[PDB]
Design an enzyme around this catalytic site. Structure first.
Site, PDB file in Angstrom:
ATOM      1  N   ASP A   1       3.059   6.489  19.819  1.00 24.00           N
ATOM      2  CA  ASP A   1       3.071   6.242  21.268  1.00 24.00           C
ATOM      3  C   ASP A   1       1.747   6.622  21.950  1.00 24.00           C
ATOM      4  O   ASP A   1       0.786   7.037  21.261  1.00 24.00           O
ATOM      5  CB  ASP A   1       4.269   6.936  21.876  1.00 24.00           C
ATOM      6  CG  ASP A   1       4.283   8.458  21.812  1.00 24.00           C
ATOM      7  OD1 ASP A   1       3.252   9.072  21.535  1.00 24.00           O
ATOM      8  OD2 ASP A   1       5.386   9.027  22.024  1.00 24.00           O
TER       9      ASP A   1
ATOM     10  N   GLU B   1       0.379   9.936  20.853  1.00 21.03           N
ATOM     11  CA  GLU B   1       0.104  10.154  19.415  1.00 21.03           C
ATOM     12  C   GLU B   1       1.290  10.822  18.697  1.00 21.03           C
ATOM     13  O   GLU B   1       1.110  11.679  17.797  1.00 21.03           O
ATOM     14  CB  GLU B   1      -1.147  10.988  19.285  1.00 21.03           C
ATOM     15  CG  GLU B   1      -2.028  10.561  18.144  1.00 21.03           C
ATOM     16  CD  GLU B   1      -3.328  11.364  18.160  1.00 21.03           C
ATOM     17  OE1 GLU B   1      -4.305  10.934  18.833  1.00 21.03           O
ATOM     18  OE2 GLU B   1      -3.357  12.387  17.398  1.00 21.03           O
TER      19      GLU B   1
ATOM     20  N   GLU C   1      -6.444  16.933  33.214  1.00 17.86           N
ATOM     21  CA  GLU C   1      -5.375  16.188  32.516  1.00 17.86           C
ATOM     22  C   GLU C   1      -4.022  16.572  33.102  1.00 17.86           C
ATOM     23  O   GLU C   1      -3.174  15.694  33.356  1.00 17.86           O
ATOM     24  CB  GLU C   1      -5.417  16.521  31.041  1.00 17.86           C
ATOM     25  CG  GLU C   1      -4.362  15.902  30.178  1.00 17.86           C
ATOM     26  CD  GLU C   1      -4.533  16.422  28.769  1.00 17.86           C
ATOM     27  OE1 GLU C   1      -4.179  17.613  28.537  1.00 17.86           O
ATOM     28  OE2 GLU C   1      -5.117  15.706  27.939  1.00 17.86           O
TER      29      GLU C   1
END
Ligand code: NH4
Length: 372
Positions: free
Chosen positions: A167, A170, A327
């Site tokens: 996905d 990973e 992130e």
């Protein structure tokens, strides 16, 4: 609505998002994922770079976005023979192993940056088709500039769309992930519906395969009226709203779009910060800027401007002193006990993450908030 205080801050974060992206763009045109994060530095992803490129194209930097598309195009033309060999292997009934497929990580010079046994993904090639077509439509450009790289990507995806792979995160190589299927679908419909590509040999095939992807998602990717993370699962993933906007499995007004936005919000959105999936232990399973931006983009598209704005404001509150967006943030952790080992092993969370900035610019633009 928005007061001068908030408008000034949101404008400045838009200006800074453009600056940090174009400052770190490689000389060759690639957008890196994160210039200072140990595990990502030195590599480019087509996923990150495509959403980054679409924020920059919306922002209006035609030159920067164009150099990214040049880069990708040239990288893919270089894989013409590799793709032809994989297709011929399939035609002989010798299906290639994950180890032989096209890569996930690229070096800035266009070589494999990682071994696809460990990270095989097909979504980024579909996202690049969506990105380059959307850019060319927005700015009136001739797609023949990038057509030979488009042809490689199309040929590869028509062959391998139905293959299990890892996905976006990973994980789970054995499964078929709905946001991966969705990324491919978005790319295939973008090229299949593009008037400049009406005579391509693959024109009709891209829309027939896109319909096969929707058939698979209808049969195995919808539970209790919402999309699910992978075929045959019940759970949601924060990436799933991308299957509505921009990738278009269903329109924003569809019941499955509404039910998917409500399931993602209920199961994964805490106070505006969206988690990836319930089991996520990466840095404790934090709140991802790009996913709050993806959900906000989907709410704007469905006419929920207020929900969109709440997610924009959440993201703006995660900018650091220099305006850099990480992130993810740990205000809410799904698995708090897992964070320490990740910080020890890879360091402090990737900041800036260019994809965070790219998504900020997309959501800002959807709300009409880019500086005038
Ligand atoms: N939109």
């Amino acid at each position: 609505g928005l007061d001068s205080h908030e408008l000034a801050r949101l404008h400045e974060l838009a200006r800074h998002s453009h600056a940090v992206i174009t400052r770190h763009q490689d000389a060759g045109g690639a957008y890196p994922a994160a210039p200072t994060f140990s595990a990502y530095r030195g590599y480019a992803w087509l996923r990150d770079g495509s959403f980054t490129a679409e924020g920059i194209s919306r922002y209006g930097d035609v030159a920067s976005a164009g150099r990214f598309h040049d880069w990708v195009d040239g990288v893919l033309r270089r894989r013409r023979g590799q793709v032809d060999d994989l297709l011929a292997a399939v035609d002989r009934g010798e299906v290639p192993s994950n180890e032989g497929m096209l890569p996930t990580r690229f070096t800035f010079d266009g070589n494999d940056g990682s071994d696809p046994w460990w990270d095989f993904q097909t979504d980024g090639y579909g996202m690049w088709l969506w990105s380059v077509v959307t850019h060319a439509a927005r700015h009136g450009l001739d797609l023949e500039r990038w057509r030979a790289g488009i042809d490689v990507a199309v040929d590869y995806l028509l062959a391998f769309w139905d293959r299990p792979c890892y996905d976006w995160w990973e994980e789970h190589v054995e499964h078929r992930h709905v946001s991966t299927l969705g990324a491919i679908h978005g790319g295939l419909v973008a090229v299949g519906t593009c008037a400049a590509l009406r005579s391509a040999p693959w024109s009709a095939a891209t829309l027939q395969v896109a319909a096969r992807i929707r058939s698979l998602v209808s049969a195995e990717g919808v539970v209790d009226g919402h999309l699910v993370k992978w075929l045959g699962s019940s759970a949601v993933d924060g990436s799933l709203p991308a299957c509505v906007v921009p990738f278009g499995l269903v329109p924003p007004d569809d019941d499955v779009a509404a039910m998917t936005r409500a399931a993602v919000a209920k199961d994964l959105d805490v106070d505006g910060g969206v988690h990836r999936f319930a089991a996520d232990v990466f840095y404790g399973g934090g709140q991802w800027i790009l996913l709050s931006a993806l959900l906000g983009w989907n709410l704007a598209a469905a006419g929920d401007t207020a929900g969109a704005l709440r997610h924009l404001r959440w993201i703006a509150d995660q900018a650091d002193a220099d305006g850099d967006l990480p992130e993810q943030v740990p205000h809410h952790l799904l698995h708090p006990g897992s964070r320490a080992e990740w910080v020890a092993r890879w360091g402090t969370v990737a900041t800036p993450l260019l994809w965070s900035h790219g998504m900020y610019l997309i959501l800002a633009d959807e709300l009409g908030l880019l500086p005038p």
